[PDB]
Design a protein around this ligand. Structure first.
Ligand SMILES: Nc1ncnc2c1ncn2[C@@H]1O[C@H](COP(=O)(O)OP(=O)(O)O)[C@@H](O)[C@H]1O
Lengths: 49, 49
């Protein structure tokens, strides 16, 4: 297995990561939306790994 | 809703009141207090047994 491209992390995190952590805090999407724009800013800036 | 976890740390020069606020929060939330130093510990018998 390899690493991941900057854009690639977006398609991961919107599906396979965000809902999981949403189940960790026990909320549903109805009250805690997180747009794509927040995700691209996150991965582009705050985490280079 | 429910209680939620997160870990937290305070840091600064010794004796700033770190542990003091710890216990103060412990009696704020009403949770029980228990210090556990781990500076320089090595053996696994004191952590896992
Ligand atoms: N704002 C504050 N209010 C009350 N006590 C303080 C404050 N700042 C520092 N102290 C004092 O600093 C000392 C440090 O204690 P503590 O936080 O319990 O452990 P540590 O030495 O690891 O910081 C305590 O005796 C405490 O009274």
């Amino acid at each position: 297995v390899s690493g991941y491209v900057a854009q690639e992390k977006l398609a991961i995190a919107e599906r396979y990561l965000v809902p999981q952590a949403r189940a960790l805090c026990g909320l549903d999407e109805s009250k805690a939306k997180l747009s794509s724009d927040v995700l691209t800013l996150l991965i582009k800036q705050y985490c280079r790994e | 809703g429910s209680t939620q976890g997160k870990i937290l740390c305070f840091y600064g020069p010794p004796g700033v009141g770190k542990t003091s606020i710890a216990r103060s929060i412990a009696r704020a939330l009403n949770r029980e207090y228990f210090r556990f130093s781990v500076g320089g510990m090595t053996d696994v018998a004191e952590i896992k047994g």
